């Protein structure tokens, strides 16, 4: 790859390769941008076609980080860490404490948490370390609620009222979060239509919150006023844009649109995108509240914020006259930009999330 | 494949480093923080491609280990290289974002001048971080050093070879009168030596000529003079299949890097019975003194640490024999020992424990 040149284009600080032979531990902290603070990313672990994707991964990933962070309204950067292994084979104690005095070489630039293929247990060894590592003491019904409430300043706009009653969802996938949000959803008088490649998880959903059942490839083309992909990501494509009766897209799934275009063009059909990024950041936004010291309910109503960040998402989106998510890359773009200027005074005794 | 390369010789981090708006494009390799923080210059130079640039900045630094460990410093191997024309691309913004990145390891790795860099340069990087030395306007030399670092090199090289540590009445190839190269020469001409020397600047020759009553050679030819010592102290790669069979002197010691082109240049220079004082070893003298620097800069004790340069080549010798292995190995042993020795020695707890950083 030509690493540098990806950096240089999208400005990029800094990836951090680490080794450690005696564990075998072979990780990519990518670290985006650090403007609004520490960069903020969970450790992904998994098995890689190539050490060139590898490294693509960790980018692409980090960059996202930047932006979810940034729209949350959080005080941190965007950064991901790869490791490149068998999660089911390849873990030990010294991978973990290796990493752990890794991230503490960065001394407070970069914070890790759980990710695809990472235990608590692993950022419990990692927390030996180092601080810099947070969801270790008291994710997935937090993201849910996330929604739960996301849902409903996408349901405003396209229905005029940010009521759920009368409104019909399909609910893609019952995973850890889906199945949280739908008991949240249906006790308030709205009808769910669930689907899943678990037929036993769907039955439970079905029988508990009175839904109907539907075959995985079925539920796009379902009697439906909202959309829920809370399983599968690039779940919006030319092939089910068409298939939609929905009029409002919001779930829990990352990369929800396949290609930019596609969020274009649901604009002009007057279907209303939450942006994946905006709504499942519940999940970053708890362990980001772990930091400056836990506190439920604070906690939540940072979480609770989602409905207006996505309102505001909404505004953009008309004032402005271009598609949910191009608003909200431009919300976070305006944020970490705006603070950068507001904050270029000069103290000596300066205050960030780490000095807690 | 960089984590298959990293994985084989047990490297620590890459670190690659970019601010847009300087256009800084910088690669820290850190090899080895086992003996404590990676010392190791900025070297900024016009790379081919990118690959070549990390290839680079891993081979420099893994060298840095060795250097450090066999010099007797507390210190890791790394070096950090910039991919830049360093007659153009250079800004203060470039300095000061490194400097920044360079705080963002807190210890890990300690920077200084080489290829590229001027101090001016460290001076703007010191702005940002204190993990950095020679700083001239605070303060090392550092060429003389080197130099007297060789000057003693050579003698315990002469011992071994030639029988007597004494240099008066022996002829000396001096390959280059660089800045090195003449205070060599200072030290050389004043213990009753003779010189030969050659330079593509014959101004510089000339210099040594009127300095120390010198003889002159043109710079193709330097290999076959009939001379007791060689010394390159002008350029590596110097010791080929090209050079060796036209070699006279019966000991080879200067302040060049990669005086070996090949690994097995060294293993045969053993079986000519040629001496060979390892590069590495050698010319250790100009990072023994930015080294002394950072512990808080004193004349005598630095020189001292530069002075030993004689007994580390002694010992690399003994082992060239008590092994009967190419000198160059003995010297790759002499630094793992050391490392691995100390590894063992100081896994003692102390929650106070003492570094170069608590100066
Ligand atoms: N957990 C969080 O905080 C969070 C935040 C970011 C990411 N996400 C996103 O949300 C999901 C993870 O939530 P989770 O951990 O609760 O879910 P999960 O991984 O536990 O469950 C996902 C469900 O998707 C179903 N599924 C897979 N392919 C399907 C298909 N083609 N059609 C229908 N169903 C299918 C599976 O049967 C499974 O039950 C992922 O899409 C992930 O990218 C969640
Ligand atoms: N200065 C130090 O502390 C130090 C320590 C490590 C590295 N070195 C080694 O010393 C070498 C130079 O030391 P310096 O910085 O004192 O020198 P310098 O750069 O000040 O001078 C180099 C001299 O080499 C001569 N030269 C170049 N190519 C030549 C050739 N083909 N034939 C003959 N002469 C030639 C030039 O005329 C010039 O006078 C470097 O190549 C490096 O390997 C020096």
Same mark, same amino acid.
């Given at each position: 790859l030509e690493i540098f040149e990806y950096l240089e284009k999208y400005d990029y600080e800094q990836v951090v390769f680490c080794q450690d032979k005696e564990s075998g531990l072979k990780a990519i902290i990518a670290i985006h941008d650090t403007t609004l603070g520490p960069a903020l990313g969970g450790t992904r672990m998994w098995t890689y076609d190539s050490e060139e994707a590898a490294i693509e991964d960790a980018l692409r990933l980090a960059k996202g980080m930047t932006y979810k962070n940034a729209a949350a309204g959080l005080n941190l950067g965007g950064a991901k860490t790869v490791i490149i292994g068998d999660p089911r084979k390849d873990k030990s104690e010294a991978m973990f404490r290796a990493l752990g005095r890794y991230i503490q070489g960065l001394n407070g630039r970069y914070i890790t948490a759980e990710d695809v293929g990472t235990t608590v247990d692993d950022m419990d060894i990692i927390h030996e370390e180092t601080?810099? @590592?947070?969801?270790i003491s008291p994710p997935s019904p937090v993201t849910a609620y996330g929604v739960y409430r996301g849902m409903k300043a996408a349901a405003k706009e396209?229905?005029?009222?940010?009521?759920?009653?009368g409104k019909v969802i399909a609910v893609q996938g019952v995973g850890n979060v889906a199945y949280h949000l739908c008991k949240h959803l249906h006790a308030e008088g709205a009808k769910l239509i669930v689907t899943d490649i678990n037929k036993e998880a769907v039955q439970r959903a079905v029988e508990e919150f009175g839904a109907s059942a539907v075959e995985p490839n079925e539920?796009?083309?379902?009697?439906?006023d909202i959309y829920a992909p809370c399983?599968?990501?690039?779940? @919006?494509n030319d092939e089910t844009i068409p298939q939609l009766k929905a009029k409002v897209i919001a779930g829990?799934?990352?990369?929800?649109?396949?290609?930019?275009?596609h969020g274009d063009i649901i604009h002009e059909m007057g279907i209303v995108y939450a942006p994946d990024y905006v709504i499942n950041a519940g999940g970053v936004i708890n362990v980001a509240d772990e930091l400056y010291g836990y506190n439920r309910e604070r906690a939540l109503k940072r979480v609770e914020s989602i409905y207006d960040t996505i309102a505001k998402v909404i505004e953009i989106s008309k004032r402005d006259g271009i598609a949910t998510y191009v608003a909200a890359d431009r919300l976070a773009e305006e944020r970490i930009a705006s603070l950068k200027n507001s904050r270029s005074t000069y103290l000596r005794n300066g205050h960030d999330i780490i000095s807690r």
């Open positions: 601080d810099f @590592v947070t969801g396209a229905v005029g009222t940010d009521n759920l009653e539920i796009y083309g379902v009697e439906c399983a599968l990501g690039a779940t @919006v829990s799934a990352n990369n929800q649109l396949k290609e930019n275009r």
